[PDB]
Design an enzyme around this catalytic site. Sequence first.
Site, PDB file in Angstrom:
ATOM      1  N   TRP A 194       0.801  -1.244   0.000  1.00 49.71           N
ATOM      2  CA  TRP A 194       0.000   0.000   0.000  1.00 49.71           C
ATOM      3  C   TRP A 194       0.831   1.291   0.000  1.00 49.71           C
ATOM      4  O   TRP A 194       0.285   2.410  -0.193  1.00 49.71           O
ATOM      5  CB  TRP A 194      -0.982   0.003   1.177  1.00 49.71           C
ATOM      6  N   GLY A 241      -6.790   5.442   1.314  1.00 48.84           N
ATOM      7  CA  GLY A 241      -5.602   5.882   2.019  1.00 48.84           C
ATOM      8  C   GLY A 241      -5.859   6.847   3.187  1.00 48.84           C
ATOM      9  O   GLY A 241      -4.983   7.653   3.559  1.00 48.84           O
ATOM     10  N   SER A 285     -12.740   2.813   0.143  1.00 45.04           N
ATOM     11  CA  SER A 285     -12.403   3.486   1.446  1.00 45.04           C
ATOM     12  C   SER A 285     -12.546   5.022   1.286  1.00 45.04           C
ATOM     13  O   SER A 285     -13.618   5.510   0.900  1.00 45.04           O
ATOM     14  CB  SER A 285     -11.000   3.049   1.902  1.00 45.04           C
ATOM     15  N   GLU A 291     -14.196  -6.136   7.607  1.00 42.90           N
ATOM     16  CA  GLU A 291     -13.608  -4.782   7.475  1.00 42.90           C
ATOM     17  C   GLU A 291     -12.653  -4.358   8.618  1.00 42.90           C
ATOM     18  O   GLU A 291     -11.582  -3.772   8.377  1.00 42.90           O
ATOM     19  CB  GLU A 291     -14.709  -3.745   7.364  1.00 42.90           C
ATOM     20  N   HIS A 337     -10.458  -5.760   5.042  1.00 43.34           N
ATOM     21  CA  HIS A 337     -10.571  -4.461   4.400  1.00 43.34           C
ATOM     22  C   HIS A 337      -9.500  -4.327   3.321  1.00 43.34           C
ATOM     23  O   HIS A 337      -8.297  -4.435   3.612  1.00 43.34           O
ATOM     24  CB  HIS A 337     -10.409  -3.352   5.431  1.00 43.34           C
TER      25      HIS A 337
HETATM   26  N   LIG Z   1      -6.345   0.178   2.366  1.00 41.35           N
END
Ligand SMILES: [N+]
Lengths: 176, 527, 352
Positions: free
Chosen positions: B80, B114, B196, B323, B436
Site C-alpha cells: 500500500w 488511504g 475506502s 472490514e 478491508h
Molecule cells: N487500504
Amino acid sequence: LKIFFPGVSEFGKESILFHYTDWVDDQRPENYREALGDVVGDYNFICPALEFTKKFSEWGNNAFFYYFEHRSSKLPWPEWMGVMHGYEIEFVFGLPLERRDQYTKAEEILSRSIVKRWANFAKYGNPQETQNQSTSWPVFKSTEQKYLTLNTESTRIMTKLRAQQCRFWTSFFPKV
Amino acid sequence: DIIIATKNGKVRGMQLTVFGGTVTAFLGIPYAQPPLGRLRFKKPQSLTKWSDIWNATKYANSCCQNIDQSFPGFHGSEMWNPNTDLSEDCLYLNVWIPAPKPKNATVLIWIYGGHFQTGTSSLHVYDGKFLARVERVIVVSMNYRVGALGFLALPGNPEAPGNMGLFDQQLALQWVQKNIAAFGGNPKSVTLFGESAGAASVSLHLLSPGSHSLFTRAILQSGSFNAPWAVTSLYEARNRTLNLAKLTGCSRENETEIIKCLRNKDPQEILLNEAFVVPYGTPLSVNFGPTVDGDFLTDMPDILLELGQFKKTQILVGVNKDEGTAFLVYGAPGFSKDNNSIITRKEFQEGLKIFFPGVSEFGKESILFHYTDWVDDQRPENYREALGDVVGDYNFICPALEFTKKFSEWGNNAFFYYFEHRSSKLPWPEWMGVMHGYEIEFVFGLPLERRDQYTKAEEILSRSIVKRWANFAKYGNPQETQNQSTSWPVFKSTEQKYLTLNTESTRIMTKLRAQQCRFWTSFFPKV
Amino acid sequence: VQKNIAAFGGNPKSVTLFGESAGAASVSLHLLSPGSHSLFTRAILQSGSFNAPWAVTSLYEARNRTLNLAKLTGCSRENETEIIKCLRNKDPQEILLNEAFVVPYGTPLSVNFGPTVDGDFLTDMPDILLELGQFKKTQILVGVNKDEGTAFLVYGAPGFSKDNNSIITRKEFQEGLKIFFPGVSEFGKESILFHYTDWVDDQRPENYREALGDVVGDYNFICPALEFTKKFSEWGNNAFFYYFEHRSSKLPWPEWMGVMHGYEIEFVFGLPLERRDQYTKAEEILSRSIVKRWANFAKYGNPQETQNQSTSWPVFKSTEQKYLTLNTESTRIMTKLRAQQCRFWTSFFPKV
Ligand SMILES: [N+]
Ligand SMILES: *[C@@H]1O[C@H](CO[C@H]2O[C@@H](C)[C@@H](O)[C@@H](O)[C@@H]2O)[C@@H](O[C@@H]2O[C@H](CO)[C@@H](O)[C@H](O)[C@H]2NC(C)=O)[C@H](O)[C@H]1NC(C)=O
Ligand SMILES: *[C@@H]1O[C@H](CO[C@H]2O[C@@H](C)[C@@H](O)[C@@H](O)[C@@H]2O)[C@@H](O[C@@H]2O[C@H](CO)[C@@H](O)[C@H](O)[C@H]2NC(C)=O)[C@H](O)[C@H]1NC(C)=O
Ligand SMILES: *[C@@H]1O[C@H](CO[C@H]2O[C@@H](C)[C@@H](O)[C@@H](O)[C@@H]2O)[C@@H](O[C@@H]2O[C@H](CO)[C@@H](O)[C@H](O)[C@H]2NC(C)=O)[C@H](O)[C@H]1NC(C)=O
Ligand SMILES: *[C@@H]1O[C@H](CO[C@H]2O[C@@H](C)[C@@H](O)[C@@H](O)[C@@H]2O)[C@@H](O[C@@H]2O[C@H](CO)[C@@H](O)[C@H](O)[C@H]2NC(C)=O)[C@H](O)[C@H]1NC(C)=O
Ligand SMILES: *[C@@H]1O[C@H](CO[C@H]2O[C@@H](C)[C@@H](O)[C@@H](O)[C@@H]2O)[C@@H](O)[C@H](O)[C@H]1NC(C)=O
Ligand SMILES: *[C@@H]1O[C@H](CO[C@H]2O[C@@H](C)[C@@H](O)[C@@H](O)[C@@H]2O)[C@@H](O)[C@H](O)[C@H]1NC(C)=O
Ligand SMILES: *[C@@H]1O[C@H](CO)[C@@H](O)[C@H](O)[C@H]1NC(C)=O
Ligand SMILES: *[C@@H]1O[C@H](CO)[C@@H](O)[C@H](O)[C@H]1NC(C)=O
Ligand SMILES: *[C@@H]1O[C@H](CO)[C@@H](O)[C@H](O)[C@H]1NC(C)=O
Ligand SMILES: *[C@@H]1O[C@H](CO)[C@@H](O)[C@H](O)[C@H]1NC(C)=O
Ligand SMILES: *[C@@H]1O[C@H](CO)[C@@H](O)[C@H](O)[C@H]1NC(C)=O
Ligand SMILES: *[C@@H]1O[C@H](CO)[C@@H](O)[C@H](O)[C@H]1NC(C)=O
Ligand SMILES: [Cl-]
Ligand SMILES: [Cl-]
Ligand SMILES: [Cl-]
Ligand SMILES: [Cl-]
Ligand SMILES: [Cl-]
Ligand SMILES: [Cl-]
Ligand SMILES: [Cl-]
Ligand SMILES: [Cl-]
Ligand SMILES: [Cl-]
Ligand SMILES: [Cl-]
Ligand SMILES: [Cl-]
Ligand SMILES: [Cl-]
Ligand SMILES: [Cl-]
Ligand SMILES: [N+]
Ligand SMILES: [N+]
Ligand SMILES: [N+]
Ligand SMILES: [N+]
Ligand SMILES: [N+]
C-alpha cells in the site's frame, strides 16, 4: 447411478450426470463424491418435501419449512458424510439437554430452542421462540418460499432452497 | 508509434501485451499547474499548455505522504506504500485504452483510498490494463493531494480553503470531459469508482453541484461520506490548522500570515507534525479531511442526504466480511499478525479506549453490552472476534447500509453486495479473515492472470466481478446475463436484499447486520 | 431516405422498417444500433430476429472463416492487411466458389458470412443488449408462419422430396438430426428426440416427418421470435404478435410442406389484390386486411382494421402472451404459442 436408478434408461441417467456435473470448477477431487450425495438427497428427500409444502400451502394453510444444518459433535460416521439423514432426531427429543452426555454447550442451546419451537407448534400452531430474541420463522408461501436455517451459530431467513435442482427433479425427470 | 492530440497538446503512449492481445497506456499525463511555492494549499489551477510531444510512458510522482513503517519487509503492508518518488509535483493521470482503439467506449475512473493521508494511483492492484483488455472499457485514475497539503482548512480564506484534493479530483473529471473523445471514450458514459476514502470521495461527488455534470453512475467499495471518519467539522479543522502552525512555530496573528509562514516550511516538517495535531488519535485517524467549505460542499452532508439533495442516478455499494480486522494490529493491545491474538475481557475493554478515545464510560459500556452477550460456548476467540466486529460495523458496514437506504428512497436503483472470499494469496494470518481492501485485486482482474498463482475458482469469481462491474458502468444493471448466474435484485428499504460474492455459491440475502446497525444508527449518535 | 424523401412527398419522421428472415434479423439489429436510432420510427419483423441461432457470427468463428477463405483462394498472408489486399485481386467468381466450404460442417440453414460484433454497428453481444434493455424504444409487430421448417428439409434431410410425401422412419429422423445439429453432442441430440417424439399417438406414419419439420421451425424461427417479443415488451413498449396460417392456393411445393417459410410475403405486398392473378376471392379479402393492418401500424403504431368489424388485435404482454391468427376463415385471439416446445429450446438447450 446404475445402483440408484436400476432402470431408468441410458438417456435418463445421462441427464442426471449432465445436470449435476457441470463444474464450478477447480478439480477439486471430492467433486463426483459430492455430486452423488446431492443426487440421492435431492431426489429422495429434499425436492419432494419442498413440493409437498408448496402444494399443501396453496390451499390456504400456514406452513413452516426448516433446513437443518448442524453436524453433531458426537456423530460416529466420518466428516465427508456431513449432516446426515436422521441426525436431527436427537436434537428434537432433547438429548443435548443432558449435560453428562458430552454434547457442547452450543449444542445444548440449539436443542433447547428446537424443543421450544416444536412445542409452541403443537400447542399454538406457531413455532416461534418468543423470549430470547430469536429469529422469527416466516410462513412458507409459493412465490417467495422463505425457510429458516437451524445451526449453532446464526439462524437465517433464506429463500428458494435448491431452486435449480428441484426444477430438474420435479418437471423434467417424471417424464423418463 | 501512438500519438494522440489533446487540448493542451500531444501525448505519446506505449503498447502492452496482455492475454494475447494489446492495450495502449498513457501513464502520467499532467492535468494541472503543479501546486508549488505560491500555489501550495491553493485550489488547482489550469495547465499552461505545450508544444512538442509529452512522453506519457512511465508512472509519475506520487503526492507527498507519511509512510506506513509498522511492518517493514512485509508484503501485506508494503503493498500500500507508494512506488514512485514523492513530490509536491504530483497532479497527473493515467489512461488505458483497448486495441484496436474503440469508437465510443464506456469509461471507469478510479479514485484510490488511504484515509485521505496516503495513496497513489500507480499501485499494482490498481493497474487498469486487464479491464481494458477484457471488457473493452477505457480506464482512468488520477493522483490527488492528501494530508494537510490537500485538506488543510481555514474556511472563507482562498489561501487555504479546504477540500483541495477533492477539487484535484474534480479537475481530473473535467479533463476526461474535454479530452476522452480523442482517445476513443464516451464522455457521456463515465462511472466513478473508488475504495475506502476513495469511496467516500465518489459519494461526495454525488453531493457536489460542480460535479453533477462530470459523470453518470457511481460504485462505492467499503466507504461512504456518512462514515464516522469521513468529514471533519469546521470546528476541529480550525483546532488542527492552528495546532499545526503552533507546532511548526508558524503561529501568527493575521490568518493569511499563518498560511504564508507554512509556505516556506519544507514538506518534511509538515509531514512530521501532521501526526499529532489531534490530542488522541486512532488507527482510523483522519488528521486532515473533507470539510464543509461552502464551495465543494455547501452544507453538512448528513442533511443533504436526508433531504434528497444529490445527483439522481444508479449506485452500486458493497462491503467486505471482516472490514475491521486490519486496524486491530495498529495498536489494540494483545493483537499481532504473528499470533492468533486470543484476548481477555480486560484487553477488549482496553481495546475500546484505543478506538473510542472519548466517548464516555457509559458509551463504552454500551458497546460491550451489545457485543458480548455470548452465544455462547467460551470459545476463547470470542473477545477477539467481537472487537473486529465493533470496528467494522461502526466504521464501514453500518454507514454503507445507511447511505444505501437513504439514497434509494428517492427513487433510484441501488445494488448492494457483501464480499466474502478470503484470497488464497493473502499475506495476513487466518484470524484476520476477509480483510478491508482485499476485494480490489478482484475488481481489477488480477486473478485473470494465470502465472499469478491464484486458484481456478478465484479466476472464475474475478471474471464474473469484472463483467458485473462493467455491465454496471455501460448499462446501470450489474447482471452476468450469459452463464446462468444469480440475478442481482435492487436494494429497496423494507426488504433490503443484497448479493453475496464468494467462490462457491452466490446467494440472495436480506437485512445485513440488522441488530448491530440498529445499535450504531439509532442508539449511539446520542452519547 | 432521411435526406431525400421530402422531395418525393414522404414524411422522414414517419418511417417503418419491415423485412423477412435475414431481413427481419437486420431490422431487429437496426433497433440495437446507436447509428440507426434516429433513422426510423417503428419496426415489423417477419419470421426472423437477431437472437435466432443462425443470425450472429461470433468474432471467433468469423476469424476462422476469413482465414479459411484466404487459405482456399491461396491468399494466406502474414500481415493481416496483406490478406485483404490479395483478396481484392481475386475475381468475384473465385470468392463465391470457395465461400461454400469455409465451414467444415454446413447445414441447409448455414450462414457462412454474417453480422458480427464489430464494435461499430454492434457494440456488444446482442443477447446482452436485449436482456438489459439497450434498444430503441418503439412499437414492434412480430410474427411467424405455421410451418417455418418444412422448406429446409428438402435441401438434404434423408428421405425427403418435393416429389413425394416423404414418410420417414425413426432411423431417418435420427439421421435428419445429424444434418441439422452437426455437433452438438449425442445427448443433446437424444434430448431433441425425446421431447418431440412422445407419441399422441396412433402411428400415424407421417409422425417423424411432422416432428422434424417442427424441430427445425421451433428452434430456428418461432421460439426466438417469441423470446424477442417478451424481452422487448418488458421495457414498456407495445408489441403485437401474429401467427400466419394460410397455405396459398397457388403454392408450387406439395401439401405436406404446409404454410411454408416465406409465403406470407406475397400477402403483405398485396399480390392477391390483382384479380387476373388467379388467387381465390377469400385470399383477396385476407390480403386487403393484412395490407390495412400493416399500413395502420406504420402510420399509427396500432395494427387494427377499424371499419369492417374485424377482430381487435391485443398487445403482447409477458404473463398473458396473446397473439392473433391470420387465416381465410376466422381470425382468433390465442395465448402462449408453442409454450411446451419453447420451454425446451429457451431454457434447456442453450446448455448442451
Ligand atoms: N487500504
Ligand atoms: C484543541 O487544541 C489543544 C491542543 O493541545 C495540543 O497541542 C498540540 C500541539 C499537540 O501536541 C497535542 O497532543 C496537544 O494536546 C487541545 O488541548 C490539549 O488537550 C489535552 C487533553 O485534553 C491536554 O492534556 C493538553 O495539555 C492540552 N494542551 C493545551 C495547550 O491546551 C484541545 O483539547 C483541542 N481540542 C480537541 C477537541 O481535541
Ligand atoms: C501475541 O503477541 C502479542 C504482541 O506482542 C508480542 O509479539 C509477539 C509475537 C511476541 O514476540 C512478544 O514477545 C511481543 O511482545 C503479545 O502481546 C504482548 O504480551 C506481552 C505480555 O507479557 C507484553 O510484553 C506486551 O505488552 C504485549 N504487547 C502488545 C503490543 O500486545 C500477546 O501476548 C501474544 N499472544 C499470544 C501468543 O497468544
Ligand atoms: C477452423 O479451421 C479448420 C479448417 O479446416 C478446413 O479447411 C477449410 C479450407 C475447409 O476445406 C474445411 O472443410 C476444412 O475442414 C478446422 O479444422 C478441420 O476440422 C475438420 C473436422 O474437425 C478436420 O477433419 C479437418 O481435417 C480440419 N482441417 C485442418 C486443416 O485442421 C477447424 O475445425 C475450424 N473450427 C471450427 C470451430 O469449425
Ligand atoms: C421419396 O423420394 C426420395 C428422394 O430420392 C428420390 O427421389 C424420388 C422422387 C425417386 O425418384 C428416387 O428414385 C430418388 O432417389 C427417396 O429417397 C431415396 O430413397 C432411396 C432408397 O432406395 C435411395 O436411392 C436414396 O438414397 C434416397 N435418397 C434421398 C436423398 O432421400 C424416398 O425413398 C422416397 N419416399 C417415398 C416415395 O415415400
Ligand atoms: C457516443 O454515444 C453518445 C451517447 O451515448 C450515451 O447516451 C447517454 C445519454 C447515456 O445513455 C450513455 O450511457 C449512452 O451510452 C452519442 O450522443 C454520441 O454522439 C456518440 N459519439 C460518437 C459515436 O462519436
Ligand atoms: C409532416 O408531418 C410532420 C410530423 O408528423 C409526424 O410526427 C412524428 C413525431 C410522428 O408522430 C409521425 O408518425 C407523425 O405523423 C411535421 O413535423 C412536418 O412539418 C410535416 N411536413 C409537411 C406537411 O411538409
Ligand atoms: C431463554 O432463557 C434462559 C436464560 O434467560 C435460557 O437459558 C433458556 O435456555 C432460553 N429459553 C429457550 C426456550 O430457549
Ligand atoms: C520520447 O520517446 C522516444 C523513445 O523512442 C525518444 O526517442 C524521444 O526522443 C523521447 N523524448 C524525450 C526524452 O523528450
Ligand atoms: C492581513 O495581511 C494580508 C496579507 O497581505 C492583507 O492582504 C490583509 O488585508 C490583512 N488583514 C488584516 C485584518 O490585518
Ligand atoms: C462465460 O462463458 C465462458 C465459457 O462458455 C466462461 O469461460 C467465461 O469466463 C464466462 N463469462 C463470464 C463473463 O463470466
Ligand atoms: C502491414 O503492411 C501494411 C500495408 O501497407 C502497413 O500499413 C502496416 O503498417 C504493416 N504492419 C505490420 C505489423 O507489418
Ligand atoms: C372494407 O369495406 C369494403 C366493403 O364495404 C371491402 O370491400 C374492403 O375490402 C374492406 N376494407 C378493408 C380495409 O379490408
Ligand atoms: Cl437465533
Ligand atoms: Cl429471492
Ligand atoms: Cl440451494
Ligand atoms: Cl458474518
Ligand atoms: Cl467488568
Ligand atoms: Cl452464480
Ligand atoms: Cl426477511
Ligand atoms: Cl448479519
Ligand atoms: Cl400448429
Ligand atoms: Cl433407438
Ligand atoms: Cl376478422
Ligand atoms: Cl392461458
Ligand atoms: Cl402451440
Ligand atoms: N447420535
Ligand atoms: N434412519
Ligand atoms: N494481495
Ligand atoms: N408464390
Ligand atoms: N426465403
